[PDB]
């Protein structure tokens, strides 16, 4: 398991999860399993935020697309949430102070090579 880097980084998650629980589409401690399931009866472009299963990441974005349900790791490094970077990514990954602000940004961006479709959240 990875412990927090600094006091700032901890207080960051407190506010990240607070604003996440208030958001309504935050599904706590849900694995990648229900993600491929709950987003099956949802249109392509429906998404949710869940707790990552990996010890390296706090949260993870799951989104239903045409190819199927795809999941996205959300790294927190130095107090900024960003999506995981691709080697073929020419443009740098956007950083954000709030985890919610990361979502709104993505609502062109592609995913290995279908586009990134963020439309509707999944209420909890």
């Amino acid at each position: 398991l990875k412990t927090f880097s600094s006091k700032s980084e901890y207080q960051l998650v407190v506010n990240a999860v607070r604003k996440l629980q208030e958001s309504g589409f935050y599904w706590s401690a849900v694995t990648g399993g229900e993600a491929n399931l709950l987003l099956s009866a949802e249109p392509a472009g429906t998404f949710l935020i869940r707790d990552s299963s990996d010890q390296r990441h706090f949260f993870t974005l799951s989104v239903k697309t045409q190819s199927g349900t795809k999941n996205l790791r959300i790294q927190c490094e130095g107090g900024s949430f960003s999506l995981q970077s691709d080697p073929r990514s020419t443009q740098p990954v956007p950083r954000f102070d709030c985890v919610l602000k990361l979502v709104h940004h993505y609502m062109a961006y592609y995913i290995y090579k279908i586009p990134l479709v963020l439309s509707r959240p999944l209420s909890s």
Partner: peptide, 8 residues
């Protein structure tokens, strides 16, 4: 699980 990365 099905994970992917975002290309810009």
């Amino acid at each position: 699980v099905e994970y992917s990365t975002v290309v810009h």
